[PDB]
Design a protein around this ligand. Structure first.
Ligand SMILES: [Mg+2]
Ligand SMILES: [Mg+2]
Ligand SMILES: [Mg+2]
Ligand SMILES: [Mg+2]
Ligand SMILES: [Mg+2]
Ligand SMILES: [Mg+2]
Ligand SMILES: [Mg+2]
Ligand SMILES: [Mg+2]
Ligand SMILES: [Mg+2]
Ligand SMILES: [Mg+2]
Ligand SMILES: [Mg+2]
Ligand SMILES: [Mg+2]
Ligand SMILES: [Mg+2]
Ligand SMILES: [Mg+2]
Ligand SMILES: [Mg+2]
Ligand SMILES: [Mg+2]
Ligand SMILES: [Mg+2]
Ligand SMILES: [Mg+2]
Ligand SMILES: [Mg+2]
Ligand SMILES: [Mg+2]
Ligand SMILES: [Mg+2]
Ligand SMILES: [Mg+2]
Ligand SMILES: [Mg+2]
Ligand SMILES: [Mg+2]
Ligand SMILES: [Mg+2]
Ligand SMILES: [Mg+2]
Ligand SMILES: [Mg+2]
Ligand SMILES: [Mg+2]
Ligand SMILES: [Mg+2]
Ligand SMILES: [Mg+2]
Ligand SMILES: [Mg+2]
Ligand SMILES: [Mg+2]
Ligand SMILES: [Mg+2]
Ligand SMILES: [Mg+2]
Ligand SMILES: [Mg+2]
Ligand SMILES: [Mg+2]
Ligand SMILES: [Mg+2]
Ligand SMILES: [Mg+2]
Ligand SMILES: [Mg+2]
Ligand SMILES: [Mg+2]
Ligand SMILES: [Mg+2]
Ligand SMILES: [Mg+2]
Ligand SMILES: [Mg+2]
Lengths: 41, 97, 134, 242, 178, 204, 26, 121, 87
RNA sequence: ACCAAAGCUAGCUCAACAACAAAUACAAAAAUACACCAAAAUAAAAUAAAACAUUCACCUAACAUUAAAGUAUAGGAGAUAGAAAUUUUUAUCCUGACGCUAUAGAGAUAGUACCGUAAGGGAAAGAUGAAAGAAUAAAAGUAAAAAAAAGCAAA
RNA sequence: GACGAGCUACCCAUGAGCAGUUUAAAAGAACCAACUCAUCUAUGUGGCAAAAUAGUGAGAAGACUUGUAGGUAGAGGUGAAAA
RNA sequence: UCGCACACGCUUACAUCAGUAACUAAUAAUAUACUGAUAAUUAACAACCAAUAAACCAAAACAACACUAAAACGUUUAUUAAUUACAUUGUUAACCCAACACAGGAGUGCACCAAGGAAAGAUUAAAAGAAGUAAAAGGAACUCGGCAAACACAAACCCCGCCUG
């Protein structure tokens, strides 16, 4: 039963809420964003 | 992560179709039937797997000892190799030793 | 004939004849300037000079003086949508020349004998759909 | 442009298409009655016009030959009823171009008519009104066409009609182009209707709209328009006609 | 020499009609001499059509009345049908070998079993060089590949079936008949 | 006839310009599910009047022009309709022509000649060796639509040219069923005389 | 072809949310 | 290197000569001059066509026919059967010599033999 | 073009030769004798459906050899295409 | 707003049951000349033994199945290897799928292109609709909108 | 266990080139081209090039260069030994 | 100023007419290389193209005659050799091997032009780098070393190998 993650979209978006107002490439690409968001919180 | 834009046709499934209504029917056959035939015989499947269970190594070694000489050359080969690998891995690896 | 087994000749053997001949022919307008005495034929690959001769004399009653045969190679270059090669097929050409001084010329086959609405919009209309009266 | 390069591209091979193209209509209007040049002054006199029309209808041999083939092919047919249905087909056709319902517009008008009345208008706003018919619709003539291939007979009934209409054409940005909605303008239309006969569904249609030679020049358009002189290359000198 | 061209009267005309191709049956009725002639009456025609064709090409002109070519072809083909027929029965009656050429089932070095078409030689086979260095037989190791061939082949059938079966489920669930 | 394994029929003939343009050499598109119909269960030919049970045009009756068996379609002339332009050049959009949208065989039933009603066709064998189409509803035998051919040639109106064999000659049986071949026959009747015989040949 | 209805459907709600930002309704 | 394309007389060196499959008409001579045998050149046997009525096509309204491929047996019936019943009824039938009906015991006598198939066509 | 004769282009050393080197005391040809090769026998020509050719075969030959024969001589006397010929 | 994005099919997986014809081994695809033909010899090592020297299951064979049993035994008596006597076994029927859905699923649209002198390696790609005999705007990346003393860029 | 000597090492057949000058000499003699190598420098270093370009150099009738075609095969070949 | 031809090897890249917005050209213009249509090299040159006996010790080297390393090459006599128009095959190119429309690798015969070809897309006239020419007085003071360069292009003595290879 090969199973995949359909919803990866939201998983990302739930991080990216907070990444909106950052300056740079930090505000889109999920990698950089994640980290930035951690430091932020 | 681009996701499907348009709703699929909702799959409608009658759970009342024949096979589902009739599920598990003769399961108790031995008991209710003054045992002659075992629940086993209700198992339709691959020759070596009927009424039996095992981990991968046992499965494989079983398929070999049963249907081995009826197998194709190449599958056979891959089977012996899977066997070897498994021998090595179950015996010779693990955290738990 | 062609694609046929031919019987092995040995000495004192019967003349080989072929009752229904398998060959075929094309008379083609020479791509090049040539003397009138010459006519040009695309024949099948397995066809010898002597063959084209006999064929021509016997079936068409044409007085052959002489014959030459060369082989044109068809292009292997062009490619398919999968990039496999396409081959225009190789074919044999044979030049013939006529005996009694008969001059030929290729017939022009096509003598050419056989057997206005301006709907452009009005310049001064301004684009209005003039179908409409008022 | 009419152009063919025969140097390379050969000639599109001549086909027998398995289905002969089936036309509901034939584009041409066979015989165009050209109305009297005094039809403006004879339109204020009722029994002058009505008399000349009815007279030329009864008197014409072609007219009644055609009405004979229509009547002998299609029972329950009458020429005194027709200008009514015809004046109706109009008010349905134009009311269709208002709303831009093209599905009914096919049922009513003919193959030749549709491309024209629909084409150049399709991006603009059309609002048109029918108020008075000053002279009730007059049947001018009838023409039959015999295709000896199909046995297919095409009746074409010509209706000359006087009308009162208010037309307003807005351009796609919302601004007016041609004419007011407040002027119920007087129009004289020479109209052609067509029917297929052998057809079991026997539809009666608007075929074409013909304008007579002396017909009044239409309303002045709003926007100014520039007609360019010929585009000159550098070495070509201009020449002015007198 | 004009036998390669149509009646000069026919040249500039697009549609040039002609008759039907010959049914096998229509030919079955003719004697042998007359089929022998019809071969040629068809032959000259064939050559004209070929010629006309190649020229149509050269001229960037669509070929007048194409079907002719198809038609002649079949008849030639059809004539052939009747000729071998009349030999084929004949030899069956005389000899009874269903095959006109000598030949034999043989087994080549690749383990395939092949139909060997025979050949003609001026000398006996055991005196022949090239014939003798041909090997018709399988050697020992080849027996392996033989099996694989079978297996390889055996899969393709195996999964052809399994596809078609599938195509029957799909349809029956797409189209609830009855 | 030229076809790839995965193909799509656009009403256009497999060997045509419109066919190379619609589905070029390098396209394989999604399969089209088509209910299987054995050729002997197929009740529709070209030329019979059929009532259309479906569409914007329904309840109507029309003649069948051509059938596409592959995707299982029928064609009723100028009945199912959409409008297309044929003539086209830069300044000119010419000739709006009504064209026929094809119809699946679920939307079309065969009309029996007598009462002009729609019916269910059923294949039957009568007592003479004949196979005809009988109505479930009306209990009649329905004809079959004898139609023209793709040639345009009607056999009854025809004249033979120079190279046409008349009916007479062609039905003439000259055959003499005897044990000689074409070869012995034609050499014997040409008068060619041969003597010498072939040396012994070997065959491997 | 066995998909998430969850995916498609949940996506639809976004789709309409943006339909509500780009044209706000009267 | 080209693996895929076929090997023709045109690809190799000087020394490589391979005919395109035309049939050989002769043998090499003493002087090196080439020798042809008049008996190896195929000789086409062509009847006079002028005298007869037949054409490359047939009338369209001319009928097709019931399609009977020729069988060995049909042939036996048309040729061998009538004479056979004729001479068994007469009682003069000789199962020993069938040659009067057209049977040929072995083929090596005649010009064109069927089984080794001496003739091209 | 002569190729259609047939004729062939093959290049190699171009020699002007009289049968004798320039040093020879005999600069001038008298007559020649050309025996015809086997291919060109009469009989072969009449077998080939070739009639007038029998004559032409001769013609051609002369017009060639003689020409060269003459030309050589001229060239040997110092004449050429731009000195033309005096005698 | 560009670039792009989405389709569900092509087929696959596991398992049950049980176009002649010519020509081709001359330098294959070349009708035709004087010969020769044909042949066999244990599998090994990687690796386990914490090294490596004796030894290291499967790797050929059929024989299955339930047991006897991981027992008797064999082992640098270490690692491991590992039996049999003797027992068990009811018919066919009844096919499928808590298998994949275009980076998955076969390498495969193909052993094709392409890469190798060769043995050999070896791809990638399909998507409108009944009918073309009808012409979502959500990834990074950019654009609409270049930057203003200071510094993990945020808080 | 197959595959490779069309590169390169060495043979084996079999072809082909070496002008002028100096010399009693075609003497593994001199001078110096074609030819063959590759000393020394500079360029070049994702190059024109996965070993080149420009100058400069040694040999140049010999143990010389070179064509086509065979031959030896990895536990081996081949080698005027540099593994 | 590497030209013509052949062998080898390449395969239609050659030819004609039409097309090029884009694809080939590392740019364009246009076309020997991109596209399509249509054509094409013709045998006298070349490939194919006998055996079995038998005599013959005696080099090629402008071959007189010799050299030492002792040197490839065929005549004739006899015995049979299907006898007879025309067999078959190669003939295009701006080409090949280097991933490229690569400053490189490529055998032979003739030529040094009668043949082939262009070093510079347009300017400017900085530094640095490359290649070249010239330089007062001085003449190795440079430098590991006269390496490179030069109006020089000569001598000598050593170590190590003897020598050509
Ligand atoms: Mg497990
Ligand atoms: Mg020939
Ligand atoms: Mg030739
Ligand atoms: Mg799933
Ligand atoms: Mg290759
Ligand atoms: Mg060759
Ligand atoms: Mg060559
Ligand atoms: Mg060559
Ligand atoms: Mg084959
Ligand atoms: Mg070891
Ligand atoms: Mg160990
Ligand atoms: Mg370990
Ligand atoms: Mg082991
Ligand atoms: Mg099954
Ligand atoms: Mg895949
Ligand atoms: Mg974005
Ligand atoms: Mg701050
Ligand atoms: Mg070598
Ligand atoms: Mg010298
Ligand atoms: Mg020396
Ligand atoms: Mg310098
Ligand atoms: Mg020197
Ligand atoms: Mg020296
Ligand atoms: Mg070799
Ligand atoms: Mg080897
Ligand atoms: Mg050495
Ligand atoms: Mg050493
Ligand atoms: Mg060392
Ligand atoms: Mg190449
Ligand atoms: Mg370009
Ligand atoms: Mg050339
Ligand atoms: Mg520049
Ligand atoms: Mg500077
Ligand atoms: Mg400087
Ligand atoms: Mg100075
Ligand atoms: Mg110093
Ligand atoms: Mg110092
Ligand atoms: Mg010093
Ligand atoms: Mg120096
Ligand atoms: Mg200087
Ligand atoms: Mg010292
Ligand atoms: Mg030394
Ligand atoms: Mg030396």
């Amino acid at each position: 039963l090969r199973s995949r993650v359909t919803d990866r979209y939201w998983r990302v978006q739930e991080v990216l809420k907070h990444a909106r107002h950052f300056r740079g490439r930090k505000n889109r690409c999920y990698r950089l964003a994640v980290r930035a968001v951690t430091r932020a919180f | 992560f681009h996701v499907r834009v348009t709703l699929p046709p909702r799959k409608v499934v009658d759970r009342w179709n024949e096979k589902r209504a009739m599920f598990g029917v003769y399961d108790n056959i031995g008991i209710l039937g003054n045992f002659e035939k075992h629940p086993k015989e209700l198992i339709k499947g691959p020759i070596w797997l009927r009424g039996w269970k095992g981990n991968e190594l046992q499965r494989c070694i079983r398929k070999k000892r049963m249907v081995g000489n009826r197998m194709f050359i190449d599958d056979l080969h891959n089977l012996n190799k899977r066997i070897s690998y498994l021998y090595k891995h179950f015996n010779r690896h693990g955290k738990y030793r | 004939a062609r694609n046929v087994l031919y019987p092995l000749y040995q000495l004192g053997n019967p003349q080989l004849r072929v009752f229904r001949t398998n060959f075929f022919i094309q008379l083609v307008r020479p791509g090049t300037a040539q003397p009138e005495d010459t006519v040009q034929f695309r024949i099948p690959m397995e066809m010898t000079r002597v063959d084209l001769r006999n064929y021509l004399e016997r079936i068409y009653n044409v007085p052959v003086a002489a014959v030459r045969t060369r082989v044109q190679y068809g292009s292997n270059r062009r490619r398919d949508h999968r990039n496999i090669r396409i081959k225009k097929p190789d074919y044999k050409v044979a030049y013939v020349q006529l005996a009694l001084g008969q001059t030929f010329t290729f017939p022009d086959l096509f003598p050419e004998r056989k057997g206005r609405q301006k709907h452009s919009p009005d310049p001064r209309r301004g684009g209005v759909p003039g179908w409409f009266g008022l | 442009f009419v152009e063919h390069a025969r140097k390379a591209g050969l000639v599109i091979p001549h086909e027998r298409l398995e289905r002969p193209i089936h036309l509901a209509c034939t584009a041409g209007i066979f015989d165009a009655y050209v109305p009297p040049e005094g039809d403006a002054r004879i339109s204020s006199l009722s029994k002058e016009g009505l008399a000349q029309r009815a007279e030329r209808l009864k008197k014409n041999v072609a007219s009644q030959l055609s009405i004979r083939k229509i009547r002998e092919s299609d029972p329950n047919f009458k020429i005194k009823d027709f200008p009514e249905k015809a004046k109706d087909i109009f008010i349905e056709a134009h009311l269709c171009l208002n709303n831009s319902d093209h599905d009914r517009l096919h049922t009513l008008v003919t193959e030749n008519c549709f491309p024209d009345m629909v084409w150049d208008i399709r991006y603009k706003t059309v609002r048109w009104s029918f108020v008075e018919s000053l002279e009730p619709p007059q049947v001018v003539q009838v023409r039959c066409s015999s295709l000896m291939n199909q046995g297919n007979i095409y009746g074409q009934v010509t209706v000359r009609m006087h009308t009162r209409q208010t037309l307003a054409i807005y351009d796609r940005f919302g601004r007016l182009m041609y004419g007011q909605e407040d002027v119920p303008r007087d129009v004289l239309e020479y109209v052609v209707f067509e029917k297929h006969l052998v057809d079991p569904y026997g539809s009666w249609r608007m075929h074409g709209k013909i304008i007579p030679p002396w017909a009044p020049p239409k309303q002045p358009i709003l926007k100014t328009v520039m007609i360019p002189g010929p585009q000159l290359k550098p070495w070509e000198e201009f020449e002015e006609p007198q | 020499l004009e036998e390669f061209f149509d009646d000069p009267k026919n040249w500039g005309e697009e549609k040039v009609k002609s008759g039907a191709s010959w049914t096998c049956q229509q030919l079955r009725n003719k004697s042998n001499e007359d089929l022998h002639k019809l071969w040629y009456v068809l032959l000259k025609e064939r050559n004209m059509l070929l010629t006309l064709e190649q020229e149509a090409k050269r001229q960037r002109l669509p070929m007048p009345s194409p079907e002719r070519l198809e038609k002649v072809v079949d008849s030639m083909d059809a004539l052939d049908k009747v000729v071998q027929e009349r030999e084929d029965a004949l030899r069956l009656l005389q000899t009874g070998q269903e095959k006109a050429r000598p030949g034999a089932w043989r087994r080549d070095i690749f383990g395939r079993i092949i139909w060997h078409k025979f050949k003609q030689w001026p000398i006996p086979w055991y005196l022949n060089k090239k014939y003798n260095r041909k090997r018709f037989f399988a050697m020992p190791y080849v027996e392996r590949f033989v099996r694989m061939r079978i297996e390889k082949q055996a899969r393709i059938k195996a999964r052809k079936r399994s596809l078609e079966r599938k195509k029957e489920k799909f349809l029956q669930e797409k189209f609830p008949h009855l | 006839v030229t076809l790839p394994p995965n193909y799509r029929y656009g009403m256009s003939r497999p060997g045509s310009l419109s066919d190379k343009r619609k589905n070029p050499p390098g396209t394989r598109r999604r399969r089209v599910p088509v209910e299987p119909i054995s050729d002997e269960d197929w009740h529709l030919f070209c030329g019979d009047k059929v009532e259309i049970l479906e569409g914007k045009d329904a309840g109507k009756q029309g003649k069948v022009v051509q059938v596409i068996r592959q995707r299982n379609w029928v064609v009723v002339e100028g009945l199912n309709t959409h409008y297309r332009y044929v003539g086209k050049t830069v300044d000119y959009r010419g000739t709006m022509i009504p064209s026929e949208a094809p119809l699946l065989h679920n939307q079309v039933k065969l009309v029996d000649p007598t009462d002009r009603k729609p019916t269910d066709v059923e294949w039957r064998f009568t007592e003479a060796g004949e196979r005809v189409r009988v109505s479930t509803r009306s209990g009649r035998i329905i004809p079959k639509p004898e139609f023209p051919r793709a040639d345009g040639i009607v056999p009854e109106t025809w004249i033979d040219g120079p190279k046409d064999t008349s009916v007479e000659d062609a039905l003439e049986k000259t055959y003499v069923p005897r044990l000689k071949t074409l070869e012995e026959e034609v050499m014997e009747a040409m008068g060619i005389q041969e003597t010498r015989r072939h040396k012994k040949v070997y065959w491997y | 072809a066995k998909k998430g209805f969850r995916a498609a459907y949940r996506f639809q709600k976004e789709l309409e949310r943006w339909r509500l930002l780009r044209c706000p309704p009267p | 290197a080209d693996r895929m394309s076929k090997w023709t007389s045109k690809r190799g060196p000087r020394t490589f000569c391979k005919g395109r499959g035309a049939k050989g008409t002769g043998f090499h001579g003493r002087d090196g001059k080439f020798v042809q045998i008049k008996e190896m050149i195929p000789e086409l046997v062509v009847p006079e066509l002028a005298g007869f009525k037949l054409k490359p096509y047939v009338n369209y309204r001319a009928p097709e026919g019931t399609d009977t491929p020729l069988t060995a047996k049909q042939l036996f019936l048309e040729t061998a059967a009538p004479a056979i019943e004729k001479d068994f009824k007469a009682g003069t039938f000789d199962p020993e010599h069938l040659e009067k009906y057209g049977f040929e015991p072995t083929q090596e006598g005649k010009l064109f033999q069927l089984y080794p198939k001496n003739f091209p066509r | 073009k002569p190729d259609k004769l047939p004729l062939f282009k093959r290049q190699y050393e171009n020699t002007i030769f009289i049968g004798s080197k320039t040093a020879d005391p005999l600069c001038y040809g008298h007559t020649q004798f050309h025996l015809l090769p086997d291919k060109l026998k009469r009989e072969k020509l009449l077998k080939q459906n070739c009639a007038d050719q029998i004559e032409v075969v001769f013609r051609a030959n002369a017009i060639a050899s003689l020409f060269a024969w003459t030309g050589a001589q001229a060239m040997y006397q110092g004449f050429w295409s731009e000195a033309d010929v005096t005698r």
